Design a protein around this motif. Structure first.
Motif, PDB file in Angstrom:
ATOM      1  N   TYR A 115       0.856  -1.176   0.000  1.00 20.97           N
ATOM      2  CA  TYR A 115       0.000   0.000   0.000  1.00 20.97           C
ATOM      3  C   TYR A 115       0.902   1.238   0.000  1.00 20.97           C
ATOM      4  CZ  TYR A 115      -4.264   2.710   0.877  1.00 20.97           C
ATOM      5  OH  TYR A 115      -5.314   3.596   0.790  1.00 20.97           O
ATOM      6  N   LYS A 116       0.351   2.396   0.371  1.00 19.12           N
ATOM      7  CA  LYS A 116       1.068   3.666   0.321  1.00 19.12           C
ATOM      8  C   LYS A 116       2.512   3.590   0.810  1.00 19.12           C
ATOM      9  CE  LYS A 116      -3.012   6.653   0.877  1.00 19.12           C
ATOM     10  NZ  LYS A 116      -3.622   7.692   1.752  1.00 19.12           N
ATOM     11  N   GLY A 117       2.720   3.185   2.060  1.00 19.03           N
ATOM     12  CA  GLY A 117       4.061   3.193   2.615  1.00 19.03           C
ATOM     13  C   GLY A 117       4.462   1.933   3.354  1.00 19.03           C
ATOM     14  N   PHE A 118       3.557   0.965   3.444  1.00 18.34           N
ATOM     15  CA  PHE A 118       3.805  -0.264   4.184  1.00 18.34           C
ATOM     16  C   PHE A 118       3.975  -1.426   3.215  1.00 18.34           C
ATOM     17  CE2 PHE A 118       1.553   2.379   7.265  1.00 18.34           C
ATOM     18  CZ  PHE A 118       2.394   2.284   8.353  1.00 18.34           C
ATOM     19  N   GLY A 136       2.944   7.826  16.342  1.00 15.82           N
ATOM     20  CA  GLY A 136       4.143   7.724  15.533  1.00 15.82           C
ATOM     21  C   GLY A 136       4.529   9.076  14.976  1.00 15.82           C
ATOM     22  N   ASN A 137       5.655   9.083  14.270  1.00 21.29           N
ATOM     23  CA  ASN A 137       6.165  10.305  13.671  1.00 21.29           C
ATOM     24  C   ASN A 137       5.316  10.710  12.469  1.00 21.29           C
ATOM     25  OD1 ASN A 137       8.409  10.449  15.472  1.00 21.29           O
ATOM     26  ND2 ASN A 137       9.503   8.952  14.206  1.00 21.29           N
ATOM     27  N   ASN A 138       5.470  11.966  12.058  1.00 24.40           N
ATOM     28  CA  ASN A 138       4.811  12.464  10.853  1.00 24.40           C
ATOM     29  C   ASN A 138       5.588  11.957   9.646  1.00 24.40           C
ATOM     30  OD1 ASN A 138       4.137  15.243  12.815  1.00 24.40           O
ATOM     31  ND2 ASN A 138       2.493  14.120  11.779  1.00 24.40           N
ATOM     32  N   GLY A 139       5.113  10.864   9.056  1.00 21.16           N
ATOM     33  CA  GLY A 139       5.790  10.263   7.925  1.00 21.16           C
ATOM     34  C   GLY A 139       5.988   8.768   8.070  1.00 21.16           C
ATOM     35  N   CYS A 140       5.328   8.165   9.058  1.00 16.78           N
ATOM     36  CA  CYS A 140       5.405   6.725   9.270  1.00 16.78           C
ATOM     37  C   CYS A 140       4.243   5.971   8.640  1.00 16.78           C
ATOM     38  CB  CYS A 140       5.466   6.405  10.767  1.00 16.78           C
ATOM     39  SG  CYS A 140       3.990   6.861  11.692  1.00 16.78           S
ATOM     40  N   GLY A 141       3.033   6.526   8.686  1.00 14.19           N
ATOM     41  CA  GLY A 141       1.914   5.909   8.002  1.00 14.19           C
ATOM     42  C   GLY A 141       0.701   5.585   8.851  1.00 14.19           C
ATOM     43  N   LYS A 142       0.504   6.304   9.960  1.00  8.50           N
ATOM     44  CA  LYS A 142      -0.715   6.108  10.739  1.00  8.50           C
ATOM     45  C   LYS A 142      -1.953   6.521   9.955  1.00  8.50           C
ATOM     46  CE  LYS A 142       0.430   9.074  13.626  1.00  8.50           C
ATOM     47  NZ  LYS A 142       1.125   9.533  12.391  1.00  8.50           N
ATOM     48  N   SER A 143      -1.839   7.552   9.115  1.00  9.35           N
ATOM     49  CA  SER A 143      -2.955   7.924   8.253  1.00  9.35           C
ATOM     50  C   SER A 143      -3.217   6.863   7.193  1.00  9.35           C
ATOM     51  CB  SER A 143      -2.685   9.276   7.595  1.00  9.35           C
ATOM     52  OG  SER A 143      -2.606  10.308   8.563  1.00  9.35           O
ATOM     53  N   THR A 144      -2.177   6.129   6.787  1.00  9.14           N
ATOM     54  CA  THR A 144      -2.343   5.088   5.778  1.00  9.14           C
ATOM     55  C   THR A 144      -3.252   3.969   6.279  1.00  9.14           C
ATOM     56  OG1 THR A 144      -0.263   5.533   4.629  1.00  9.14           O
ATOM     57  CG2 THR A 144      -1.128   3.294   4.509  1.00  9.14           C
ATOM     58  N   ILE A 145      -3.116   3.583   7.549  1.00  4.79           N
ATOM     59  CA  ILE A 145      -3.960   2.518   8.084  1.00  4.79           C
ATOM     60  C   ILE A 145      -5.418   2.957   8.141  1.00  4.79           C
ATOM     61  CG2 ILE A 145      -4.394   1.052  10.084  1.00  4.79           C
ATOM     62  CD1 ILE A 145      -1.364   1.214  10.631  1.00  4.79           C
ATOM     63  N   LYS A 161      -4.146   4.315  -8.910  1.00  4.37           N
ATOM     64  CA  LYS A 161      -2.803   4.102  -9.437  1.00  4.37           C
ATOM     65  C   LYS A 161      -1.754   4.874  -8.646  1.00  4.37           C
ATOM     66  CE  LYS A 161      -1.689   5.802 -13.637  1.00  4.37           C
ATOM     67  NZ  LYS A 161      -0.830   6.819 -12.969  1.00  4.37           N
ATOM     68  N   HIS A 162      -2.107   6.052  -8.133  1.00  9.14           N
ATOM     69  CA  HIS A 162      -1.160   6.867  -7.385  1.00  9.14           C
ATOM     70  C   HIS A 162      -0.869   6.323  -5.992  1.00  9.14           C
ATOM     71  CE1 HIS A 162      -4.292   8.786  -4.816  1.00  9.14           C
ATOM     72  NE2 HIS A 162      -3.252   9.103  -4.064  1.00  9.14           N
ATOM     73  N   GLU A 163      -1.684   5.402  -5.483  1.00  8.19           N
ATOM     74  CA  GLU A 163      -1.465   4.822  -4.165  1.00  8.19           C
ATOM     75  C   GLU A 163      -0.599   3.569  -4.201  1.00  8.19           C
ATOM     76  OE1 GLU A 163      -5.246   4.253  -2.239  1.00  8.19           O
ATOM     77  OE2 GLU A 163      -5.372   6.387  -1.741  1.00  8.19           O
ATOM     78  N   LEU A 164      -0.228   3.093  -5.385  1.00 12.34           N
ATOM     79  CA  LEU A 164       0.654   1.941  -5.486  1.00 12.34           C
ATOM     80  C   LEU A 164       2.032   2.279  -4.935  1.00 12.34           C
ATOM     81  CD1 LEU A 164       0.186  -0.099  -8.787  1.00 12.34           C
ATOM     82  CD2 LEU A 164      -0.465  -0.626  -6.436  1.00 12.34           C
ATOM     83  N   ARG A 165       2.636   1.318  -4.239  1.00 12.50           N
ATOM     84  CA  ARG A 165       3.999   1.500  -3.762  1.00 12.50           C
ATOM     85  C   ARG A 165       4.940   1.656  -4.948  1.00 12.50           C
ATOM     86  NH1 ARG A 165       8.276  -1.934  -2.392  1.00 12.50           N
ATOM     87  NH2 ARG A 165       9.775  -0.952  -0.967  1.00 12.50           N
ATOM     88  N   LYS A 166       5.816   2.657  -4.876  1.00 14.26           N
ATOM     89  CA  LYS A 166       6.682   2.997  -5.997  1.00 14.26           C
ATOM     90  C   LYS A 166       7.624   1.849  -6.335  1.00 14.26           C
ATOM     91  CE  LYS A 166       6.496   6.745  -8.476  1.00 14.26           C
ATOM     92  NZ  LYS A 166       7.283   7.919  -8.007  1.00 14.26           N
ATOM     93  N   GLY A 167       7.410   1.217  -7.492  1.00 10.25           N
ATOM     94  CA  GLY A 167       8.218   0.102  -7.954  1.00 10.25           C
ATOM     95  C   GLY A 167       7.446  -1.198  -8.074  1.00 10.25           C
TER      96      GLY A 167
HETATM   97  N1  LIG Z   1       4.013   5.658  -4.175  1.00  7.40           N
HETATM   98  C1  LIG Z   1       4.750   5.791  -2.932  1.00  7.40           C
HETATM   99  N2  LIG Z   1       6.021   5.500  -2.878  1.00  7.40           N
HETATM  100  C2  LIG Z   1       6.720   5.611  -1.756  1.00  7.40           C
HETATM  101  N3  LIG Z   1       6.151   6.030  -0.619  1.00  7.40           N
HETATM  102  C3  LIG Z   1       4.858   6.352  -0.583  1.00  7.40           C
HETATM  103  C4  LIG Z   1       4.105   6.243  -1.731  1.00  7.40           C
HETATM  104  N4  LIG Z   1       2.832   6.622  -1.430  1.00  7.40           N
HETATM  105  C5  LIG Z   1       2.796   6.948  -0.155  1.00  7.40           C
HETATM  106  N5  LIG Z   1       4.016   6.789   0.380  1.00  7.40           N
HETATM  107  C6  LIG Z   1       4.383   7.047   1.782  1.00  7.40           C
HETATM  108  O1  LIG Z   1       3.314   7.203   2.516  1.00  7.40           O
HETATM  109  C7  LIG Z   1       3.727   8.258   3.718  1.00  7.40           C
HETATM  110  C8  LIG Z   1       2.553   9.181   4.043  1.00  7.40           C
HETATM  111  O2  LIG Z   1       2.337   9.122   5.448  1.00  7.40           O
HETATM  112  P1  LIG Z   1       0.782   9.143   6.015  1.00  7.40           P
HETATM  113  O3  LIG Z   1      -0.001   7.934   5.425  1.00  7.40           O
HETATM  114  O4  LIG Z   1       0.101  10.445   5.595  1.00  7.40           O
HETATM  115  O5  LIG Z   1       0.808   9.032   7.664  1.00  7.40           O
HETATM  116  P2  LIG Z   1       0.941  10.324   8.676  1.00  7.40           P
HETATM  117  O6  LIG Z   1      -0.055  11.364   8.286  1.00  7.40           O
HETATM  118  O7  LIG Z   1       0.670   9.880  10.102  1.00  7.40           O
HETATM  119  O8  LIG Z   1       2.336  10.895   8.581  1.00  7.40           O
HETATM  120  C9  LIG Z   1       4.731   8.939   3.316  1.00  7.40           C
HETATM  121  O9  LIG Z   1       5.893   8.768   4.286  1.00  7.40           O
HETATM  122  C10 LIG Z   1       5.135   8.371   1.898  1.00  7.40           C
HETATM  123  O10 LIG Z   1       6.461   8.151   1.849  1.00  7.40           O
END
Ligand SMILES: Nc1ncnc2c1ncn2[C@@H]1O[C@H](COP(=O)(O)OP(=O)(O)O)[C@@H](O)[C@H]1O
Lengths: 56, 68, 68
Positions: free
Chosen positions: C3-6, C24-33, C60-66
């Motif tokens: 998914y986005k970052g996990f 967690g920190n701002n940039g870990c992915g709590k919003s992603t869950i 398509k934009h939510e796919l993990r890069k790669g």
């Molecule tokens: N296509 C992608 N490729 C790499 N990383 C991604 C991609 N899409 C989303 N991410 C990661 O998802 C993270 C976004 O964090 P987020 O879900 O908003 O949680 P929070 O708001 O708590 O910081 C970012 O650190 C970003 O690196």
DNA sequence: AGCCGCGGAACAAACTTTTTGATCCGCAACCTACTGGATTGCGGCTCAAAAAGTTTGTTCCGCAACTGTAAATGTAATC
RNA sequence: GUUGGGCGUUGCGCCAAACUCUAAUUUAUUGAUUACAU
């Protein structure tokens, strides 16, 4: 803040000194103006674009 | 449940249609079926291809708001 | 999964407790869950209220890069 | 393994509600008595103009249960 | 939080014991197995 509604709307002014006061004391950090400034500054540096139009 | 089951005709085989809408819950007592009208629209779409200037029917309704 | 970052995440929410907190920190992915709990909660609500049988999905934009 | 109608959506022209940049006109100021010129200046009030905020008509996207000749099978348990 | 033993006001109550890689078994008129009727 930053969303598709500003970046996707990218598609001039010479950025005079009296500009940056405009839309300042409103309450939002308008990324649209920053993106436009970025584009205008970096454009200072067509066949490919015409090819993109024809291929589309 | 509620269903409108008007049946159309084009000087020949009957082309049916059922327009239905049921509240969630009692869902199996009425369903819509657009099979005949989709077929008839496909017939006219094919007609426009073989003959560009092919005749089409006129469909219109007028409420009281014509002159008001 | 991808998914986005996990890359691969497995969590189990407590049932005897009625409150779960993500820290967690701002940039870990709590919003992603939370964004992953929706797009499935939307589907559940759609099939519990409406007959549409539609909802959200992975763009398509939510796919993990790669990954694919 | 195929894809019904239903309803949100992703876009995109029209309405529609304010942000801005002059223009004006009392309106107290001068000046001296008072229309003092042959004056300025200064702050509410209003003007369309245009960069922002909805609102509404069209186009694809997705998804369920089972299909045309066709198994009632003493007990428990597996995929 | 999960697992094995014991008693009997036994489609399970109690007693007596144990274990923690961040983290619990469900399909029949089918096929494999235990068992009775053959
Ligand atoms: N296509 C992608 N490729 C790499 N990383 C991604 C991609 N899409 C989303 N991410 C990661 O998802 C993270 C976004 O964090 P987020 O879900 O908003 O949680 P929070 O708001 O708590 O910081 C970012 O650190 C970003 O690196």
């Amino acid at each position: 803040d930053v969303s598709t509604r500003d970046i996707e709307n990218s598609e001039a002014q010479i950025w005079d000194k009296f500009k940056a006061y405009n839309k300042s004391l409103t309450g939002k950090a308008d990324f649209k103006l920053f993106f436009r400034w970025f584009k205008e500054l970096i454009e200072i540096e067509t066949a490919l674009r015409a090819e993109i139009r024809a291929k589309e | 449940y509620a269903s409108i089951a008007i049946n159309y005709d084009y000087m020949g085989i009957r082309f049916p249609m059922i327009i239905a809408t049921t509240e969630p819950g009692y869902e199996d007592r009425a369903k819509s079926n657009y099979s005949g009208i989709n077929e008839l629209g496909s017939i006219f779409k094919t007609a426009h291809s073989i003959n560009p200037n092919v005749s089409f029917p006129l469909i219109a309704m007028y409420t009281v708001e014509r002159a008001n | 999964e991808n998914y986005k970052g996990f890359e691969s995440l497995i969590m189990d929410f407590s049932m005897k407790k009625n409150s779960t907190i993500l820290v967690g920190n701002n940039g870990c992915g709590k919003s992603t869950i939370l964004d992953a709990i929706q797009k499935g909660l939307t589907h559940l609500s759609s099939r519990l209220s409406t007959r549409s049988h539609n909802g959200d999905g992975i763009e398509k934009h939510e796919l993990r890069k790669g990954q694919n």
